[PDB]
Every structure is written in C-alpha cells, then in structure tokens.
Design a protein around this ligand. Structure first.
Ligand SMILES: C[S@@+](CC[C@H](N)C(=O)[O-])C[C@H]1O[C@@H](n2cnc3c(N)ncnc32)[C@H](O)[C@@H]1O
Lengths: 87, 107, 76, 93, 377, 95, 86, 98, 107, 93
DNA sequence: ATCGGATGTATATATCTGACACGTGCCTGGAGACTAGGGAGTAATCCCCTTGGCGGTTAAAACGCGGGGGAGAATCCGTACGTGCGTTTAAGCGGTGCTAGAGCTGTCTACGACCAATTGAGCGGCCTCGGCACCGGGATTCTCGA
DNA sequence: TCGAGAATCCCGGTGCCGAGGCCGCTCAATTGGTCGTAGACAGCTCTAGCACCGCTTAAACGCACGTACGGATTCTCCCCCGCGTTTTAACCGCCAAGGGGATTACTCCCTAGTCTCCAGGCACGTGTCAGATATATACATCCGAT
C-alpha cells in the first residue's frame, strides 16, 4: 500500500462460471477443464491489444480518461467496429 | 425566396445538406459534386430503411412495439446481405442467434 | 354494396356505398374511418384514377370490387 | 456544444416503414453509429476512386461505384436504384 | 452421331411458312447470296428446290462449312423431302457423311455431297412442293441454323466492326442466342398477326427470327450504331435471298436504323399496336431506362415486354407521378436464363417478362414483393 | 437429476436468446484497469469505455467459442479443448 | 460461335495436378479426391469476387482494359494486398 | 521389381520441392482463359492488361496456398493427414468466408 | 542562397520533399506540418532499412548478391514483427516459407 | 510522362545497409509498393487522428501516434526513435 | 540393425544473356524568401463525471461428491488415393501483323468553391404517460426413471 | 408409455422511467451572386493486347497395383457435468471530494500561397557480369534383402 493500490492479477476474476456462460452463448455443450486458463489468456491478449490502442489514442489526445470513443476507435482499427457507443 | 431543403427536393428524409457538409469537411476530396451528397444520403436512407424494416418485423414477431439492440442484431444477422455487410461489426447488447448444432442435440 | 380498398402498407379496408355515392364522399369515409387527409388520397380503379367530380356509377363499379388508395407522402 | 446525429432522420425513416413502432435510445445510438460507419466507408471509397483517376471531385458516379464495391449483391442494386432515383428527382427541380 | 438432333423440339407452324405459290410460279432462282466459298478442295451443294443454283464450300479438314453442309443435308432429309425419298436419302448419304465428318475424310465428304446432289436431281420438284404445302411442324433447330447460315454469310466477315462501341455501360452489343429467342417467343405466345418490336436490335437477329418462326404481321427493329445498322441491312438482304432460295415466306420486317428509339415517331406510333416488345436492357443506364419507360407509356394491354433487367427499378413505388404510369400495370415475372442463352457469356442469369394489365398489379402493394428476397429467435 | 448435457442445452438456449453481459461488471473492470496499469500514468476509464470494452470482449469470445465448437465437432468431439481454441485463432490469423 | 468466341467452362483448366501442386506447396501430404472439385469452386468464387471488383474499377475509369493496378486495388479492398504490381 | 517409393515419400519430396520454389503452379493459359471467362459476364469485351492476369494469378495462388495450409491444419487437427472438403469448408467458415 | 535538401538536413536518404508533397496532395488533412514529412520519411527509411537488411541476409544465405522477391518473402515471414505488420500482404513471386508439419514426416 | 517512385531511395538505403548487394526489378517494385503501402497506412491513420481530435493539421505528433498504432511492438519503438532523431536534427539546422 | 541398388538432388565447371547499374540531358518538381491569415498553444474557470469508500443483501461462485458419458486407445476392414508408366494433350516459346484503346495535348464551358444575408430545421431542456420490466400465480412442456 | 418433477411460457396486475412530443434559440443550410479551373470533348500518337500459325516437349490423363490410413466397432476409465451446501463479493444506493474535460479568450508562430531559381531524379542509352542453364558426377536418402 505505497501510493496507489496496485491491483492483483484480476484475471481469475473472469471466473469459471463466466467462461462457461460465454461458451454456452457460443453453442458449446461440453467444456474441457483446460479451456478456462486458455481463454483467460486469450481474453488477456485481446484486452491488452485493444487497451493499448485506446490508451495510445488517449495519450495522443493529451487526456487521462480513456473515453468510449477511444475504445470504439481502437476496436475499429482492429476490424472489430463496435456500435452503440458513438462513431 | 422561401427556403426549400435539398432533402425535400430529392424526396429524402435524410439530410442532404448535412451529408454535403460532412463530405466537404471530411477531406474526402478537394471538391464535391452537387449530386454526390444527394446520392449518398439516398443510399444511407435506404440502408437505414432496410434495417429498420427488418428490426420492426423482429420486434413485431417478438410482440414488442419498440426496437432494442437485440432486434437490430436479429435483423442484421438473419439477412445474408446485411450480415455480410456488417460481418466485422459488433452490435452492443445484440447477443447471438439461437443456433445449436445438430451433432449437439441429444440422440 | 360492399367494396374493398388496398393500401401500400398491406391493409384491406371494407367500405359500404351505393353506386350513386360520389368520390368525395368515399374520401370522407376513408377520412372518418382511418384519419387520412383527403388531399393525400388518390383512388385507382382498373388502372384509371378516379376523379373527385365524377361518381362511382360513372366508372361502372361492380359488386365486391377492388380499389387502390395511394398516399401523397412528399411527391416530387 | 451541440452534438449532431442522425437521430431524427432515423426516426423519420422508422415512422415511414413502421408507423406504430418506436426505437430505444441504445438502438437509436446503434443506428446512428451504423449510419456514420456506412457514410465514412462510402466516402472513403469514393475518395480512393477519385484519387485513382487523379480527379479532384466526388460526383454521383464515384459514390455509385463505391456503393457497388461495398454493398453485397442485391443491396448494391437496390441502393443504386435509390441513389439514381434521388439524384434524378433532385436534378429535375 | 448426327449433325441435327433428330429428337429435338419440333416447332409447330402456325402460318404458311413455305411460300408455295412463289415456288410454283418460279423454277429459276435469280438471287445472289453471299457465297460460302467467297468467305475467308471445294465442293458444290445442290439446292433442294431450285435446280439452277449451286453453293460452293471450301472443304478441307485443315466458321465450319462442313458442319453447315451436314446440317443442311440432314434438314433436307428431315423437312423438305417426302417419302419414300426421305428414307432413301437418310439411309444412303447420312451414315457415310457422318462417318466422313467424324474421321475428317475429305474425299468421303465430297463423295457424299456428290451422291446427294446426284440423288436429289432425279426427285420430282412437284412432290417437294406438295410436301412443303402439307408441312405443319419443323425442327426447332432448323430456323436457328438457317439464321446462323445467314449470320455467317453477313455478320462474321464484318463481326469485328461490332466492337466499335465506345462506352462500357451503354450502347454495348450483345446477342441473344436463337434457342433463348424461341423459348421466350413460346413463353410470350407470339402468333400470326401479332406485332413484334425490338428496341436496340443490334444486327436484327430478334426481329428476323420473330418474323420467321412466329409469322408476325410486322417485326420492327430500332438501332443507333452505324456499324450495326450496315450489318443489319446486309443480314436482311442475305436473309431475303436465302428465304427466296428455300421458298420460305418472310413477313413484313421494318428497321429504323442509325436513329434512336428515343423521341422517334415510328417507334412511338407503333408501340400502341405492339403485341411483344423485346428490350435487351442488360447494361442500359438509368436515364435510358427512364426513356424506355417514357416510350412504353403508350403500350397497350396484353403487350408483353421481354428484358434482361426489370423495366421497373426494383424499388419502384406509387406516390405522386405514377398514378398515370404504365409501369404500375405491369405483372413482372422473373425466369432463369439457361446455359447458352446469350452470346456474351455461357453462364446465364435472369430475365423478366412484364405483361401490361388492365388494372394495377397487386404485387407492389404487398411489402413482401418489394423486398430483395420469419425474423424471430 | 437430469442426464449430463440436458442442463447444458437448457443453458445454451437460455444464453443464446438473452443479451445481458455474462461477465460480472466489477471483475472485468478491475481486469481492464490491471491491463492498463502498465502505462504508469493513472487512467480514468470513462464508464462507457469500460462497457464498450466488455461488449467487444464478450462478442469476441462468443465468436471465438463458436469457432472452437466448430473445430471440436470437426474432430468428432463435443468437448472443446485448448487445441480447438488454438486452431481457431491460428486459422483466423491471430497467431 | 456468334460475334464473340464464348468460352466454355475452363475451370477444369485448373487441373488436378495443378491443385495437387498448390496443396503440396501448402504442406499437404495427402489429398482427398473430392478436394479438386471443391477447390475449383472456391477458386471460381474468389476470382469472381476479385474480377468483379476490378471490372467495377475499370467501369468507373471509363476504360475497357483491366489494368494491373485495378486488380491491385480490388485485392486491397478485400484485404488481400498484393505487392510487385504497383 | 522396379524401385518404387512407398506412399507419402514422393509427396514429401514434392512438398520440399514446391515450398522452396516460387514459380506459378497454375499454368498461364488455363488461368488466363478462366479469368477472361469470369469477366465475360460483363457484356463489354475487356482487354486484361497482361500484368493484370499475372497479378490475379499471384493473388489466387497465394490465397489457395494459404487456404491449403489452413486445410492441412484442420485435417491434422482431426487426427488425419488427408485433407477433405469438410476441412476446406471449416477453414473458410472460421476465416469468415462462409 | 544555396539549396540544401530537407532530406540532407534531416540526415535521411528518403525524399522529405516528396513525402511532404504527397501528404499535401492526398487530402489527408487541411494542412500538413513542417515536421511531419521529415518524421514520416525517417519512419519509411527505417522500415526500408529493416526489410532490406533482412533480405540481404537472406540473399547472402543463398549465396546470391541480388535481392529477389523470394528473399523479401523470407525476410518478412521469418521475422515475427514484420510478418504481423505484413500479415495481410501478398508478395508476388515470394513463395512460402519451408515448413512441414511434424505428423506428416515419417515416423 | 514521368512516373515517380522510391526506386533510387530504396537503392540508396540498400547500398547503405548492404554495400555489395544488388536488387532486382521485381524486388524493387515490391519494395516501392511496400513503401507506398506503409505511407498510405501511416498517412490515413494520422488523418484519422487529426479528425478525431478536431485537429486540421498533421503534425509530427500525429505521425508518431500513427506509427505507434500501426507498427507492432519493437518496430514501433525503433521507428519512433529514428523519427524523433530525424526531426530533432532537421529542426536543429 | 545393417548392406547395396537405384533414385533424387546438391555440388561443380563452364558458358551465355538480358537485366542490372551506371552515365547523361534536362525539366519539372523541390527549395529559398516573403506575406498574411488562422489554427493551435497556453491560461483561466465550471462543474461533469470520475474515484473511493460505505454498508447491506443476495445472487453467484466455490467447493465437494456421485456417476455416466464422452474421450482416447486398440483392432480390423477395405477402399481410396499415392506411385509408376505409357499415352495423349496442349501449354509454352517464338515469330508476325492489326488496330484500337490508353495516354497526352488543346479548347472552353459548365460547375463547384467562396462569400454575405437570411431564417427555419434541428438540437438542448422539460413534462408525461404507456410500453416494458418485475413480481405472483396458473398452465404448458420436456426430462427421466420407472 | 407414464407420472412426478422441474423449467419455461403465459396471464394478470402493478410500477416506473425513458421515448415521444412540445417549447425556445441558435447557427448551419439555403439562396444568390461571381470567378477560377476541372474535366468533358476532340484530335493525334503509338504501343501493346488480340489473334494466328507451327513445332517441341513438359505436363496431364488414364490405368493398374497395392498399402496404409480413414472409418467403424469395442473397450476402458476418468473427468466433467449436475446437484447441494456454504462462502464470497458483486451490485446497489449512497455519500462526499476533486481531477480534469469542456469551454472561452487571447496571442502569435506556422503553414498555405506565390514567385523565382536551380539541381535531383526520371527517361533514355549502353556496358558487362550475376544468375540461369546444361552437363557431369560425388553424395544423401529411401527401400528391400538379410
Ligand atoms: C444488348 S444489344 C441487343 C441486340 C439484339 N436486340 C439482341 O438481343 O440480339 C442492344 C443494342 O441496342 C442498341 N442501343 C442501345 N441504346 C440505344 C438507344 N438509345 N437507341 C437505339 N439503339 C440503342 C445498341 O447498338 C445495341 O447493339
């Protein structure tokens, strides 16, 4: 507890039931026990890419708030155009 | 003389004037033809009309009188051409269609 | 005599007239039944537009006939 | 500062196609973002076509070709029909 | 194998296609068709009806004159000749001719041609004229191959001139193959006495084919390109000569050449009486489609309009300036093009027939029709 | 006791016809912030931005799991395994 | 053979050894016999898309010759960015 | 008997030969005719600048080679070395082409 | 008034002037900064240096002193970051990297 | 007329990095197309950044951000370092 | 496992050839030097939306325990495709000619940019009520073990 | 086939907050002028894409053998589903503080524009040598016999 609460890994916060729900929405009847760690890593990679692009946009704008338009532009850069948050 | 919107001249609901101003301010080209914004506004109105017609059909089939993101998702994905147009697009609060593979159904 | 009218939105409207009823009266009944302004209404029978000054009997309307209504949304 | 959008126009089109059906705020934002996305797609493609021909003007021909390139199949045909009809109605005024 | 599909469709004649009176009043042929030899070991083919005319073909297995000769002889054995001569001719020359053609036997092919000429020259002409008077049906491929003979005589020597169209999306030349023409004419129910119009006739294949295989009282063709106009004149002259050679009657055929159907007095005055109108609008741009609509305003009831693209723009509606329009009274029916239906491609596609009705078509009022093609979870 | 796979199919039906976010909001928000702390500046993450990140991540993972299920069925299996995800991302071009 | 020499199917011209070589370049050891027709279909679809885009580009330019740069633009539209032709 | 390699050996030899080379594996004239045919759907008689057909062949061969790489990955994933139409369909479905 | 090219000032080999003219003429924005073309030319020079250095290494490995498209393909695909940058890029006459899956090799 | 390209500049960079290595015309065209493609990518991304900030000019900052967005990882770091070096040297003299 | 036979393929020397690299004219694009506008930096202020924390509550998550159903392994069939070999096809090279379609140059006329005055469309704020969300209860529809 | 048992659907009533409509009030679209110039049309050039022919021979095609692997069947077993109980921590509604994102205002440096100067680089031409190809053969690899 030095100056800012350095957050923990918080990738286990994507719990096993949440991954099961995401799979079930995808039409998955059975899930191997190793899927959870694999898709946790996949989600971490995807979030790292998108957040890196969004924070690049934010830092270029000389802002300190990752605005929803920044995330929309970051996703649009990667060919994952997101609707409903402006554009 | 009395003002008459170019959208009214073209029989379009969409804003021909705003489309022209966006084309000019968007640095798409040094010059922008007079008929270009009318054509683009008509195309945008058409695509909006198609998606809203399909979404309203979805809402009526779902016994709701108000279009929500789920109805837009159903309208977009249930149509082959619109889905292909919006293939790389994520619609917030859309979910996915009901699809269970025939292998997964019980024997 | 019962007649049917078809609109662009896929609806059929039933209407009761005699042959002597004038076209303006028909437009007024469409008004009081559906709420459409009369000036926006255009009535088509057999590919011929019905004139307000003429009567239904002028065009030789038959029983259980079909008509079409067109709404002037914006026009030109 | 005024935040422009296609909200009223999407609503007008909705009342043209489905008079008795509304549209929600989230759905309204999604439709506005869709209109913006397709607008920038078509405008960028028309800009690229203008550049390739070394032309400084975006005319209805450029937008028509852009619509042909982007929209798949029957969507392109119907959109081009609407564009041609609208431009024809506009030029006769 | 045979040159002609003997089991192919047999079109039923609905008018006196073979001019019997001309054949009885004339026995010496005076026309001068473009000879096959002049196109660019020779064999002379003997005309079945007229003794005085010989057609020379450059016979060499090193445009296929041999295939044309085989087709002509087979059609003669099938159509023009009565029994017992038809059976004798079938049994004698056709097997040897087919064997020679398959084996590329030049000497055998020429010997078969000579045997055919020798055997025909003893047949009575009166019997041939009697059979032609009695005929009521002929193979669907006979008119097609006859028109192709005329086409090869006229269009192939100057076919390249058809490629002078300067534009990409208008005035582009493309033909509809005779099989497709017979299919659509049968679908549209062309009959004797009807009027056929062709907007943009190209070289005039459609007009002449209608005039031949349907007996139209007037087959009309409008063309703007100078090259296509000159080719149309040449093709029509060759067709008249060949029809006189075979005795076939050719009905009234009219052409408006080197002038657009737009704002044309003749087209405008003929549209009201027209019974079928063929408009190959595959690449007609939007303004030309509007001009076609303006012309077709005066079309009558029952007049069927064939096209490769729908006359109505697919999002056509009725709000203000369409209550008086002809397009509201069109029943549009789409059908699928077969393989080898059009000249410019083999794949195919779609084509529409729009029938003019007394009343407004009820299809456009239903929103289901206007859609391109339930939506629920 | 329902047989194995019955409640799985019921859950598939329930979540395919519903649109709510399937990942808890606060754990995902903390994940996003943790991913962003590698830039030493303290960011603020406008709440609509975090919702947008959750929307995009859930849609991406749903499409990924659809592809994973297709791969698993291609191998004549119904159980998805990490090799299925690896194949899906390899074919998609993400690895 | 009317005014234009209409081409026959010519998708068999993408012959079985050619598809075999394409597969072998991809690291394919063994090939099912039904790969050839399905690959012909896939190639026809891809070429139809690219050529349709290229001919659209040519149509806009009021040209009748499909330049190589048109094909490069058509491939760039599909995300198939091609180098070596400008 | 004559010297005969067992199955799968000459296939690996071909893989090594064609992965280390760069020439076009589809013959020029058949692909040219295929391209011209695919363009005859348009009525206009197109000319196809000679570099354009070559670029089409480059792109199509690269696309098919990538497709067959993905197909081979799918086939190996199913515990098989034989690619099948199901494999290509899976590859094109995952890639987003179907 | 001696003329000294901006590429000479920046110490770059690439054409700062042509890059500025291309930025201006492309309608990328209403105006283009003075430091923008220098920076972009430097970036292009660096990436060209990377591609050509790896390609020259590939050519030297093949005992060849001319970079051909194959050498560019090997340089691009054997380096992970350049491959990811050029992931969707097809290099004409480039071929494919030599790779055979492990299961396909004989036991 | 003249058809411009980066052939001479690519060749200069080649003789800088590899003095005794030539390059073929096909490889030269590929390298020229690569430079054109990267220039288009960076310029388009910088245009998007200028628009998103309601900024009408493309400064070196916009190009730097576009490079950070486009080039992966270590490439972006080295490209940014080289660009900063070039801009500093240019502004010094 | 190890030894020869045949095969493919890499090494080697020689020997072409046409594409690369270098030299030169010049001309058109880059560079130097004002000028003036306006876009962007910097400073001040508002207050919107962020953080951080709180306590309470309740759904969701985690743990653990059957058990059965799907994964993986092993066996065996048979047929489908790899590998040669002889035959057939037609692609590839290599010359020639056509001519027409892309490219460049020269009017000039329509059309779009720019600017100023006007005002009605469209956006920000604020009711307000009705369509959608929640909750209780009854009917409908698998699911599964019998 | 059946019946208890569990989701799930539906019916009704209640509640609420956000979609829809209304009211100002900007300010961006419209109208109407000119005026620069983009490009549409026409003419000319010229070079490259189409088409043809003939010969060589490399690749394709068909057929036959056989073998190895795709597919089906059967077995084991272990791990992942489903359910019950407990725990944990998300979600809520809440309060407050304040970080910094909009916003406006002022100044002024940077870049568009233009005009002239000039030299860098693109077209053209020419030497010559890196690579392609053929030939000859040592060497590595596959495969069958022992
Ligand atoms: C697609 S071709 C059809 C030829 C022929 N009717 C057939 O189907 O076999 C259409 C022809 O119409 C002609 N054409 C196009 N526009 C025309 C116009 N506006 N007026 C007269 N002819 C026109 C062209 O010369 C072209 O040859």
């Amino acid at each position: 507890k030095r100056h800012r609460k350095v957050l923990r890994d918080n990738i286990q916060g994507i719990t096993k039931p949440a991954i099961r729900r995401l799979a079930r929405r995808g039409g998955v009847k059975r899930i191997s026990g190793l899927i959870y760690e694999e898709t946790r890593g996949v989600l971490k990679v995807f979030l790292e890419n998108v957040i890196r692009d969004a924070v690049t946009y934010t830092e270029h704008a000389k802002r300190k708030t990752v605005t929803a338009m920044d995330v929309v532009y970051a996703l649009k850069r990667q060919g994952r155009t997101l609707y409903g948050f402006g554009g | 003389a009395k003002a008459k919107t170019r959208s009214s001249r073209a029989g379009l609901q969409f804003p021909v004037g705003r489309v022209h101003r966006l084309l000019r301010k968007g640095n798409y080209a040094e010059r922008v033809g007079a008929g270009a914004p009318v054509y683009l506004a008509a195309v945008l109105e058409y695509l909006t009309a198609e998606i809203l017609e399909l979404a309203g059909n979805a809402a009526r089939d779902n016994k709701k009188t108000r279009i929500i993101p789920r109805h837009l998702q159903l309208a977009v994905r249930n149509d082959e051409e619109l889905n292909k147009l919006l293939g790389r697009v994520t619609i917030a609060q859309g979910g996915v269609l009901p699809n269970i593979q025939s292998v997964l159904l019980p024997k | 005599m019962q007649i049917f009218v078809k609109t662009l939105t896929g609806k059929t409207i039933t209407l009761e007239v005699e042959p002597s009823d004038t076209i303006e009266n028909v437009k007024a009944k469409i008004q009081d039944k559906e709420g459409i302004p009369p000036d926006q209404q255009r009535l088509i029978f057999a590919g011929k537009q019905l004139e307000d000054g003429r009567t239904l009997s002028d065009y030789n309307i038959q029983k259980e006939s079909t008509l079409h209504l067109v709404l002037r949304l914006r026009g030109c | 500062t005024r935040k422009e959008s296609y909200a009223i126009y999407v609503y007008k089109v909705l009342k043209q196609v489905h008079p008795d059906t509304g549209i929600s705020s989230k759905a309204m934002s999604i439709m506005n973002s869709f209109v913006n996305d397709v607008f920038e797609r078509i405008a960028g493609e028309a800009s690229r076509l203008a550049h390739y021909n070394k032309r400084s003007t975006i005319t209805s021909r450029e937008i028509q070709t852009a619509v042909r390139l982007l929209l798949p199949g029957e969507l392109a045909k119907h959109a081009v029909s609407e564009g041609t009809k609208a431009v024809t109605c506009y030029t006769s005024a | 194998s045979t040159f002609v599909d003997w089991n192919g469709p047999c079109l039923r004649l609905q008018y006196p296609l073979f001019d019997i009176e001309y054949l009885r009043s004339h026995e010496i042929y005076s026309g001068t068709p473009i000879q096959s030899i002049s196109l660019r070991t020779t064999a002379k083919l003997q005309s079945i009806l007229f003794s005085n005319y010989m057609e020379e073909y450059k016979v060499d297995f090193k445009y296929n004159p041999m295939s044309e000769i085989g087709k002509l002889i087979e059609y003669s054995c099938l159509v023009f000749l009565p029994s017992p001569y038809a059976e004798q001719l079938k049994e004698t020359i056709l097997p040897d001719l087919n064997a020679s053609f398959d084996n590329s036997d030049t000497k055998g092919f020429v010997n078969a041609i000579n045997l055919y000429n020798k055997m025909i020259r003893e047949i009575p002409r009166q019997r041939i004229i009697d059979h032609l008077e009695t005929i009521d049906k002929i193979p669907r491929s006979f008119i097609h191959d006859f028109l192709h003979i005329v086409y090869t005589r006229s269009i192939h020597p100057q076919a390249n001139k058809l490629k002078h169209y300067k534009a990409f999306s208008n005035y582009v030349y493309g033909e509809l193959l005779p099989n497709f023409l017979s299919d659509v004419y049968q679908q549209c129910q062309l009959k004797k006495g009807d009027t056929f119009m062709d907007l943009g006739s190209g070289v005039g294949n459609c007009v002449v084919q209608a005039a031949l295989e349907c007996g139209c009282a007037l087959s009309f063709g409008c063309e703007i390109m100078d090259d296509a106009s000159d080719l149309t004149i040449l093709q029509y002259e060759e067709l008249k000569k060949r029809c006189k050679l075979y005795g076939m009657r050719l009905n009234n055929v009219e052409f408006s050449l080197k002038k657009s159907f737009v704002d044309n007095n003749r087209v405008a005055e003929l549209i009201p009486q027209c019974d079928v109108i063929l408009v190959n609008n595959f690449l007609f741009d939007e303004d030309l489609n509007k001009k076609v609509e303006k012309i077709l305003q005066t079309a009558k009831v029952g007049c069927k309009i064939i096209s490769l693209k729908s006359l109505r723009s697919l999002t056509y509606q009725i709000n203000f300036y369409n209550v008086e329009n002809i397009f509201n009274r069109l029943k549009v029916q789409r059908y699928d093009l077969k393989e080898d239906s059009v000249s410019w491609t083999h794949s195919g596609g779609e084509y529409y027939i729009s029938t003019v009705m007394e009343d407004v078509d009820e299809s456009l009022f239903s929103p289901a029709a206007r859609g391109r093609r339930p939506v629920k979870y | 006791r329902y047989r194995p796979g019955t409640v799985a199919l019921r859950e598939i039906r329930r979540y395919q016809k519903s649109t709510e976010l399937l990942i808890r909001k606060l754990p995902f928000q903390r994940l996003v912030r943790e991913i962003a702390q590698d830039f030493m500046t303290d960011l603020r993450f406008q709440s609509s931005a975090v919702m947008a990140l959750q929307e995009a991540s859930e849609a991406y993972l749903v499409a990924l799991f659809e592809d994973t299920n297709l791969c698993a069925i291609h191998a004549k299996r119904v159980t998805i395994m990490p090799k299925d995800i690896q194949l899906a991302r390899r074919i998609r071009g993400e690895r």
